[PDB]
Design a protein around this ligand. Structure first.
Ligand SMILES: *[B]([O])([O])[C]([C][C]([C])[C])[N]C(=O)[C]([C]C1=[C][C]=[C][C]=[C]1)[N]C(=O)C1=[C]N=[C][C]=N1
Ligand SMILES: [Mg+2]
Lengths: 222, 235, 240, 244, 212, 233, 195, 231, 204
């Protein structure tokens, strides 16, 4: 019997800052126990200061990104070159996903950018289209390894202030772009160590009012 | 006989040009756009005194930020309004936002030329579509059965249109207030109407960013009519 | 399928097929509607060219769309059955989905929408029928009376007439009907309706039908003798 | 293209009439006269065959009277071929109703259905209307004995006595004169034949130029019988009533 | 999931948890399981996250179209039946939904309909839906009265979700409260269970089983 | 849904300083039966692209016809068909990739793994993979089936990352490919000694080599191997 | 849903139907009315798969109410039952069949006789003096076989119905939260509020 | 006369009158100009208003990052045809990862307009289009007629009084073709060309509409104070 | 699960001297639960008799269908349908549902009105005609009926004797089947009279 789904591995991570947003992902692509590519880009600039990644089955992932990029193009045609806001892009992606409810895109989608007040934004989707705005989200194979670390080091969960002993929580001070990139790099280094499908390279896309910048870092190739 | 989608020797579609003549027979409708809002007004024109005039619905809501006035074969407008409301709500569902006034107008105009031997004939009604959005602010459009739409600072359609348009030519400036625009619609409607203008045979409406689209009460319009009479008698 | 555009514009901006459908209404027997303070009455003309008729089984002019709404008409009889059927189906559909019966305005809007659709659809002609739709909204005591016509336009009326010699009976109603004080009782409302028909009918025997509709699905059709008593009282007052 | 050749069968005249319906009615006025008379204890159906021949096999012939079911029958006036299309449709509708509700179809419901089909041909489809007028004679337990008529317009009405086809004006006057409400079947038989005998365009009314039928409760106890008269039985009733 | 809603003197109380799971993995603790359909209508979410979100968001578009067409607020009965009729068309295809449609109108009064992807549509005074529904029912049924103050009713709803959050492994995160009245719904905050549990334990003298 | 019947094994490929190399053996297997010994599985498109196909052979022949038809269609109303508007490797790949994903989405896949090798207009090396699932990826070395497990390791020792491409000559690259084909013949039970090789260089163009054989094989050490453990004779 | 009963006496038809609605492990409601009025003198109770039951009942209700308006006439219980059977007999060979069993209790105003029809989801119709769907009949038919008399009064019918419900409450494992009882006679349909 | 009732009828001299009547609609439309060099291609369009209160009808439509057109005639018909181009440009990008050639775009428009001239019931398109674009063979300018005829040109103009601008370009042919790597000077030549078609009215800030595409220049449209520089 | 044995029931038919007989039980059940004891399985259209066993919803549906078809036949033909012709009509009607069949076991019985010749026939669920001289059997106790008929039957039995033979065949076959019984009916059919007799039998 033919099986229309496959698993290309990989892992992605989105973090929203005060006036910026990042969307990261490793560059490794796999089937079973073989490496297909050590550098296959997974996070994409889709225009309108929006970055996107659809992690899981790469065929469905590429198809979806392709169709959303297309949606942005037609949004400009149909509505007088209006900028597609991050919240509008999110709702549009829900309908793309649910459109194939009974034969789903087998992916975990994440988009990142800035909202209409200029503040950082990250949205997260399941395969059949449910979505929610979040301050922090990891997706894909090593999502279970990374999320707990982010609950602790981004939202200061289970952390309190010395001397008070559990009475006063640690205050939720904001994180700079340099501070976030440090947490992203450590998250992927740690994930690479304990997950076989994560490695080779790390590509981060940073989004600010000025535009979309890229940074690349080597990861362990074993 | 002859085709429904036939061109005339001058390069115009016979049926479209004929539908425009039906619109000239319709009751007057006026729209004025300002920096403080857009005003829409119509002539009700009841055929008999026994006809309950408040049931005459020639000003209609499309969304909270878009209103619409009609003139001509008003029965034809019902399916156009239904499409407009569906388009407005559908876009909000797909994109989690209000739809641009121009994009709504364009969607309505796409129906216009879907006729042949689809529907059997063009629409016999013209629409004034007024609204607001964050990109282009307060806007007023004129949608025809040809499929063409023009934006306007001010516009009049119906039987007293060319007389009203000439009046709007002189009166409109870029610093008009909303109160000034309301009175200006009432003034011009009173000028072109057969019967004497009152709160029962004429209807006002506006669209603002704050309050959205509102059809005016008969008590509210009556005061604006009384305010008009006094200021004309003042000089 | 037959796709021919039968309803089309003319150089002077008229759709003749829709206008000729109104001429079929002009030919039809007269129908009248009058709403009082707590009731609505529908009067209808029966042409007496047809005797040896079986009045038990002959299709009546006033039709119940639901238990609280009625519909009378003027024009082609066969065409009216199609509108009545569609209306009756939509009434049950509304109850099924919204869990509430139709408002008189909604039912009218539906029937008017059907009529309009037949003015710009291929291969079909317009309905040669104008209707009077009357009743009371659910849990509401305010009377409702609406009119429709082939073009598809509709509106509410304090009182209205359609059909042959409707110009005359509308003239009568315009001077006799006061808005500030409408017919307070059932008697007064029926009397005014019979009076208006007597301006046109001929004989007051089996030529006048009357149907009274009251709030909360209270609909009844008057008999020959009951109507004949109204006919008797009107003329005896007139002899003065 | 094809528009050039379209007659446009479903349009209004400037006076608000349907051309094709009016012209179809003109066709029907030349057809053989058919009469229906309703009595307290039954219904009569009488009809005149059109200029026959001596070489026409009469005992196996049927052009006027048709059976829709055991309770309902029709008299035809117009194009026989058109009528048979409708008759078979009506026979099917009656069987659909019986299968659905397990009860015989009420007369009016069957009449309304056929009449609605005729209406459709006047409003849409671009086809010519059926050139047929029916007299329905039937019985059900709601309204009892009933007489209806339908015409190409799709309009139908109920009657105590009625005629269709040729010379209806003359025929209807004669029926209006002699008909009374307390009348019986045997009397109604005589009235139907006497009316045809006076309105006929033929020199004399004979057994070979007629079709006759009765719907009686004259069946053993509470039930209804249809009788389509045989040639010899029409000959006998002509002698009995004193026409030959 | 644990979601509840109940009628009382001061209108309707709606309370939900925040947890979403994929197997044993906790996918999200910050899920918005109450949908703001309009200023007068709320919908609860249980079962499939996507099915519930998509169709309850869609649901608001149908209602908005109703009041545009009819110039009148849609009834809770008509509202719930639009959803139930829709899912009935998809019956068999594998939709997974357990929902309450809650609102208040002049003609109906405070009304709650349970709507279900099997097609089940039920009017009622009290409903609890989700994997932790049984836990919430215990607290509600023993403490429910018609004559409750808005303050006391809000707490009962909050406490019932807390009960289920504790025991049910697939419920937790935080509690979202809503109060539905004559003049619409009113949001009553996000309450983290990590802080709410210890607060309730201390003040109420409950959960003596657990050590603190 | 189907099952593959007549099948083709590994296709291997890599990049080098001025272009790309690709290779595949000439066998069409029918299960364990090595049925057809003269099957060409590298199919050139123009003078700048070579498409290597593995998997079901009937589906390969269908794809071959689609490509043949693609060249014909591109020439229609195209005065620059042999110049600026000629078919690029990137165009040919994206077309196939579209078809493969569409067919998997109708639950009726083309049972293949495909590698499109070529050189673009601007001289850039093109090498990308696509299969029955519509999955796509690019890498300095690409291989299908058994090649993925055995060839890639060897080829990655020559070009391990992007920066190793300019440092790799055509002679070094062809040597690595030919060696990999020998290793596959040692170790793949559905491979043959005969194979085809294709080079696409930005300077010297397309070179297509047929009827190549695996040579310089080591077997002499077999004579010393006796029994399965304890046996001495 | 679970238990639905019916009994035809001298001058009326009595239908009894459980109040519980159980979805899985919990009883979501204990006051559910598993019946719809098809016409003034015809009542239909129902039980089967969730959703399908109400959807089917209201669909039938709408169709009969449409007939009533069109003809200004109430169909006989026999005619309504035949319509319902055909809809189910059509349904059983559909893509997704209606999984619903019904009892139709009506008073025929023409014959002045009460009538009870039992129809299952396959479209299997039978006229009976007393009937039941599901596991209900396994307990109740033995009692009715003993006590029923055709000429029982309505009060005697209710007592015999109480004896049936008592037995069900004793021997059935599922708590069905009692029954809603409705009487159908010459004067129409009414509900017994205390049972 | 007797042979102009529909599009399915030739006249005795072999003419299609319905197509010719559609061609007339273009002549009634407002003037628009198109010209190109080797590096850039430019569209200049005179927009028309209903009155002083009204806006000026838009004339230029974008089809892709590298292609677009200007219209003259029935605006809705231009919307239908430009929508078709958008789809075809898009099909080429999604399927073949290939920017659609301007010449092949003209071929597709030609074949779409043709079907409407040979079948009963339908009608010809009532609009003329000027398509500009930059593809793998450099800058291009096309002229579309609803008869189906499409023509590649260095420069051209369509609409009312378009003959004046067409003559100017015919003189300036040798000059403006050489304007390489200078967008502003190529627009100046386009603005000076359309000026030869003006009578009574002149080019104001909300009257003029310009669009450009080139080597390192995506298809962009200029309106309002952005064209005050060229007045 | 098996559609042909959910409800249960039997039908048997026989020929005699210038006569035919057809008989059936009265049970309708839901597997083990006995629901009705008044479910007759023999219907007639004019002088042609049809007995149907199997799934009860189909028994009812087919009866209504053959009433529909025989009524239209009579209106067009102007005569009652004969047993030979009706047999062909049943076969046609069943085979048109070849791959979605009615789960039934029909049995035709009657005397041809012109020739006077006695006629019986049986069918499978999809149309195949069994036209026996002696007897036909159908239902959940068909095996039992085959055994009874094969031993009790002799040719050229007089009407009143044929009644005893067919009655004893049905009764004793039904008493060896769990899903048959609960009453029984026997039709004796002569050229112009038909007698219907209800049999007293054990009610378990
Ligand atoms: B609740 O448990 O029903 C919850 C409500 C939902 C709206 C967030 N559902 C889930 O958590 C389901 C799994 C499930 C658990 C228990 C019962 C039924 C279903 N999870 C999801 O739908 C889901 C969605 N996206 C990511 C992960 N999980
Ligand atoms: Mg690793």
């Amino acid at each position: 019997q033919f099986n229309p789904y496959g698993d290309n591995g990989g892992t992605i991570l989105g973090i929203a800052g005060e006036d910026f947003a990042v969307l990261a992902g490793d560059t490794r692509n796999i089937t079973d126990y073989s490496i297909n590519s050590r550098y296959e880009p997974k996070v994409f600039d889709c225009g309108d200061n929006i970055v996107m990644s659809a992690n899981g089955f790469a065929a469905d992932g590429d198809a979806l990104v392709k169709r959303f990029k297309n949606s942005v193009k037609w949004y400009h045609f149909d509505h007088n070159d209006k900028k597609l806001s991050i919240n509008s892009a999110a709702r549009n992606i829900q309908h793309l996903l649910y459109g194939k409810r009974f034969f789903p895109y087998y992916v975990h989608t994440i988009i990142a950018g800035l909202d209409e007040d200029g503040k950082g934004a990250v949205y997260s989707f399941d395969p059949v289209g449910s979505y929610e705005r979040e301050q922090c989200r990891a997706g894909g194979a090593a999502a279970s390894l990374i999320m707990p670390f982010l609950d602790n080091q981004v939202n200061f969960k289970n952390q309190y202030e010395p001397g008070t002993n559990g009475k006063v929580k640690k205050p939720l001070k904001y994180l700079s772009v340099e501070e976030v990139i440090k947490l992203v790099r450590d998250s992927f280094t740690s994930a690479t160590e304990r997950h076989i499908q994560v490695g080779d390279g790390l590509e981060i896309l940073i989004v600010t009012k000025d535009g979309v910048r890229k940074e690349f870092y080597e990861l362990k190739r074993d | 006989d002859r085709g429904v989608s036939t061109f005339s020797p001058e390069g115009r579609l016979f049926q479209v040009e004929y539908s425009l003549e039906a619109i000239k027979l319709g009751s007057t409708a006026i729209g004025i756009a300002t920096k403080e809002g857009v005003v829409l007004g119509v002539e009700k024109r009841a055929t008999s005194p026994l006809l309950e005039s408040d049931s005459i619905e020639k000003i209609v809501e499309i969304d909270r930020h878009i209103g619409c006035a009609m003139s001509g074969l008003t029965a034809d407008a019902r399916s156009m309004i239904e499409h407009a409301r569906t388009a407005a709500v559908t876009h909000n569902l797909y994109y989690d936002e209000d739809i641009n006034v121009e994009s709504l107008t364009q969607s309505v105009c796409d129906l216009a030329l879907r006729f042949g031997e689809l529907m059997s004939r063009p629409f016999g009604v013209a629409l004034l579509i007024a609204g607001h959005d964050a990109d282009d602010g307060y806007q007023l459009f004129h949608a025809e059965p040809s499929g063409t739409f023009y934006r306007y600072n001010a516009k009049a359609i119906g039987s007293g249109s060319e007389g009203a348009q000439a009046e709007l030519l002189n009166e409109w400036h870029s610093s008009l207030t909303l109160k000034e625009a309301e009175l200006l619609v009432l003034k011009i409607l009173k000028q072109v109407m057969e019967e004497k203008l009152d709160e029962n045979n004429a209807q006002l409406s506006c669209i603002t960013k704050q309050d959205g689209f509102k059809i005016y009460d008969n008590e509210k319009t009556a005061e604006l009519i009384k305010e008009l009479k006094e200021k004309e008698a003042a000089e | 399928g037959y796709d021919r555009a039968l309803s089309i514009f003319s150089p002077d901006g008229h759709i003749f097929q829709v206008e000729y459908a109104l001429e079929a209404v002009k030919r039809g027997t007269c129908a009248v509607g009058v709403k009082g303070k707590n009731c609505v009455v529908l009067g209808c003309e029966r042409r007496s060219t047809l005797k040896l008729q079986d009045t038990r089984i002959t299709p009546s002019k006033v039709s119940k769309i639901d238990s609280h709404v009625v519909l009378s008409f003027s024009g082609l009889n066969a065409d009216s059955r199609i509108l009545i059927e569609k209306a009756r189906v939509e009434a049950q559909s509304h109850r099924l989905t919204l869990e509430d019966p139709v408002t008189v305005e909604y039912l009218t809007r539906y029937v008017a929408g059907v009529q309009q659709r037949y003015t710009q659809s291929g291969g079909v002609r317009p309905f040669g029928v104008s209707t009077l739709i009357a009743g009371f909204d659910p849990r509401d005591d305010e009377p409702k009376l609406y009119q429709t016509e082939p073009s598809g336009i509709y509106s509410s009326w304090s009182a209205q007439t359609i059909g042959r010699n409707s110009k005359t009976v509308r003239e009568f109603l315009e001077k006799n009907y006061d808005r500030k004080e409408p017919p307070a009782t059932v008697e007064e409302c029926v009397k005014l309706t019979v009076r208006s028909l007597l301006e046109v009918v001929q004989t007051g025997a089996k030529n006048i039908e009357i149907t009274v509709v009251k709030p909360d699905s209270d609909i009844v059709a008057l008999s020959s003798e009951e109507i004949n008593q109204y006919v008797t009282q009107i003329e005896q007052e007139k002899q003065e | 293209g094809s528009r050039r050749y379209d007659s446009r069968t479903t349009i209004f005249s400037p006076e608000g009439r349907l051309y094709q319906v009016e012209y179809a009615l003109e066709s029907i006025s030349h057809a053989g006269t058919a009469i229906g008379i309703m009595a307290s204890d039954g219904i009569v159906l009488a009809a005149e065959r059109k200029v026959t021949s001596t070489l026409l096999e009469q005992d196996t012939s049927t052009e006027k009277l048709y059976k829709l079911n055991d309770k309902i029958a029709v008299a035809v006036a117009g194009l026989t071929a058109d009528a048979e299309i409708l008759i078979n449709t009506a026979r099917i509708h009656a069987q659909n109703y019986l299968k659905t509700y397990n009860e015989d179809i009420p007369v009016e419901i069957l009449v309304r259905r056929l009449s609605d089909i005729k209406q459709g041909y006047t409003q849409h489809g671009g086809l010519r209307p059926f050139g047929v007028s029916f007299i329905y004679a039937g019985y059900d337990d709601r309204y009892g004995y009933q007489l209806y008529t339908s015409n190409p317009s799709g309009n139908y009405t109920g009657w105590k006595a009625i005629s269709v086809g040729a010379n209806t004006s003359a025929a209807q006057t004669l029926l209006q004169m002699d008909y009374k409400d307390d009348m019986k079947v045997d009397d109604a038989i005589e009235l139907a034949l006497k009316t045809l005998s006076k309105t006929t365009d033929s020199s004399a009314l004979t057994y070979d130029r007629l079709e006759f039928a009765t719907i009686r409760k004259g069946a053993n106890d509470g039930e209804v019988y249809q009788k389509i008269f045989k040639p010899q039985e029409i000959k006998d009733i002509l002698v009995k009533t004193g026409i030959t | 999931t644990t979601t509840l809603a109940f009628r009382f003197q001061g209108g309707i109380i709606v309370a939900v948890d925040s947890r979403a799971t994929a197997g044993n993995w906790v996918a999200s603790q910050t899920v918005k399981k109450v949908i703001e359909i309009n200023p007068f209508l709320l919908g609860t979410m249980a079962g499939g996250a996507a099915d519930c979100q998509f169709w309850e968001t869609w649901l608001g578009s149908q209602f908005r179209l109703h009041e545009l067409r009819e110039k009148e607020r849609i009834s809770v009965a008509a509202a719930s039946k639009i959803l139930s009729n829709l899912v009935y068309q998809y019956k068999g295809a594998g939709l997974s939904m357990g929902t309450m449609i809650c609102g208040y109108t002049r003609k109906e009064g405070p009304t709650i309909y349970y709507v279900d992807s099997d097609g089940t549509r039920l009017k009622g005074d009290i409903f609890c839906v989700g994997s932790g529904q049984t836990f919430a029912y215990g607290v509600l049924d023993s403490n429910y009265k018609w004559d409750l103050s808005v303050e006391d009713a809000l707490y009962l709803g909050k406490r019932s979700i807390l009960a289920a959050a504790h025991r049910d492994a697939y419920s937790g995160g935080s509690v979202n409260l809503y109060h539905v009245t004559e003049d619409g719904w009113i949001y009553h905050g996000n309450h983290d269970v990590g802080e709410l549990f210890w607060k309730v334990k201390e003040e109420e003298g409950s959960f003596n089983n657990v050590i603190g | 849904t189907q099952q593959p019947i007549v099948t083709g094994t590994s296709v291997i490929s890599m990049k080098y300083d001025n272009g790309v190399i690709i290779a595949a053996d000439n066998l069409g297997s029918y299960g364990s039966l090595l049925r057809f010994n003269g099957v060409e599985r590298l199919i050139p498109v123009g003078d700048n692209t070579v498409v290597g196909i593995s998997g079901d052979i009937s589906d390969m022949q269908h794809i071959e016809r689609l490509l043949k038809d693609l060249v014909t269609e591109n020439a229609y109303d195209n005065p620059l068909a042999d110049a600026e508007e000629a078919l690029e490797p990137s165009y040919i790949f994206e077309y196939l990739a579209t078809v493969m994903y569409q067919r998997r989405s109708k639950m009726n896949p083309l049972w293949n793994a495909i590698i499109v090798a070529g050189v673009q207009s601007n001289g850039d090396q093109f090498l990308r993979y696509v299969n029955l699932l519509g999955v796509t990826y690019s890498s300095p070395t690409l291989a299908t089936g058994f090649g993925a497990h055995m060839a890639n390791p060897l080829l990655r020792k020559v070009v391990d990352r992007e920066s190793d491409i300019p440092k790799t000559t055509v002679q070094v690259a062809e040597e690595a490919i030919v060696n990999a084909m020998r290793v596959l013949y040692y170790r793949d039970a559905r491979s043959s000694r005969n194979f085809s090789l294709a080079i696409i260089d930005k300077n010297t163009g397309l070179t297509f080599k047929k009827n190549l054989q695996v040579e310089n094989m080591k077997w002499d050490f077999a004579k010393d191997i006796k029994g399965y453990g304890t046996q001495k004779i | 849903m679970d238990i639905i009963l019916g009994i035809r006496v001298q001058d009326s038809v009595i239908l009894a139907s459980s109040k519980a609605v159980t979805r899985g492990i919990s009883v979501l409601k204990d006051s559910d009315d598993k019946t719809r009025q098809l016409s003034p003198h015809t009542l239909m109770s129902f039980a089967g798969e969730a959703g399908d039951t109400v959807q089917f009942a209201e669909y039938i209700q709408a169709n009969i109410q449409l007939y009533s308006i069109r003809e200004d006439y109430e169909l006989s219980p026999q005619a309504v039952s035949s319509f319902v059977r055909q809809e189910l007999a059509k349904s059983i060979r559909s893509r997704r069949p209606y999984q619903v069993n019904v009892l139709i209790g009506g008073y025929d105003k023409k014959k002045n006789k009460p009538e009870l029809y039992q129809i299952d989801y396959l479209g299997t119709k039978v006229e009976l003096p007393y009937g039941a769907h599901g596991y209900s009949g396994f307990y109740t038919f033995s009692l009715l076989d003993h006590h029923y008399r055709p000429d029982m009064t309505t009060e005697e019918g209710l007592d015999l119905l109480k004896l049936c419900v008592q037995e069900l409450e004793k021997r059935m494992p599922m708590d069905f939260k009692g029954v809603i009882v409705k009487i159908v006679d010459k004067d129409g349909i009414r509900q017994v509020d205390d049972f | 006369n007797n042979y102009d009732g529909d599009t399915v009828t030739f006249s005795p001299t072999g003419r299609l009158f319905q197509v010719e009547y559609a061609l007339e609609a273009i002549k009634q439309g407002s003037v628009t100009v198109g010209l190109r060099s080797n590096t850039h291609a430019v569209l200049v369009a005179l927009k028309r208003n209903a009155d002083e209160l009204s806006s000026y009808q838009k004339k230029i439509i974008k089809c892709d990052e590298h292609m677009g057109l200007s219209l003259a005639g029935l605006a809705p018909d231009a919307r239908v045809l430009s929508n078709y181009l958008r789809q075809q440009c898009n099909y080429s990008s999604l399927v073949f990862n290939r920017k659609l050639a301007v010449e092949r775009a003209g071929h597709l428009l030609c074949d779409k307009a043709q079907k409407n001239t040979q079948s009963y019931g339908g009608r010809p398109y009532g609009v003329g289009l000027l398509i500009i674009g930059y593809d793998k063979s450099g800058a291009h300018l096309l002229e579309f007629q609803p008869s189906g005829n499409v023509t590649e040109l260095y420069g051209t103009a369509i609409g009312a009084r378009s003959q004046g601008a067409k003559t100017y370009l015919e003189r300036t042919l040798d000059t403006f073709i050489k304007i390489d790597g200078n967008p502003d000077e190529l627009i100046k030549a386009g603005v000076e060309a359309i000026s030869q078609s003006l009578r009574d009215e002149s080019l104001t800030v909300d009257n003029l509409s310009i669009a450009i595409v080139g080597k390192d220049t995506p298809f962009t449209i200029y309106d309002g104070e952005a064209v005050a520089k060229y007045i | 699960s098996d559609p042909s044995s959910i409800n249960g029931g039997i039908v048997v038919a026989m020929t005699g001297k210038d006569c035919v007989a057809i008989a059936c039980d009265l049970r309708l059940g839901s597997q083990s639960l006995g629901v009705s004891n008044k479910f007759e399985k023999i219907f007639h259209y004019g002088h042609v008799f049809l007995g149907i066993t199997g799934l009860a919803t189909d028994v009812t549906t087919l009866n209504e269908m053959f009433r529909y078809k025989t009524n239209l036949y009579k209106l067009k033909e102007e005569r009652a349908i004969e047993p030979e012709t009706f047999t062909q009509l049943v076969s046609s009607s069943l085979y048109e549902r070849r791959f979605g069949p009615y789960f039934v076991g029909p049995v035709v019985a009657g005397i041809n009105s012109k020739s006077g010749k006695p006629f019986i026939a049986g069918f499978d669920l999809i149309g195949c005609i069994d036209e026996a001289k002696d007897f036909i059997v159908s239902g959940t106790a068909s095996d039992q009926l085959f055994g009874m008929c094969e031993s009790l039957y002799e040719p050229n039995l007089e009407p009143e004797d044929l009644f005893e033979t067919i009655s004893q065949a049905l009764l004793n076959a039904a008493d060896r089947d769990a899903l048959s019984g609960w009453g029984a009916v026997v039709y004796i059919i002569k050229k112009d009279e038909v007698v219907k007799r209800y049999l007293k039998m054990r009610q378990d």
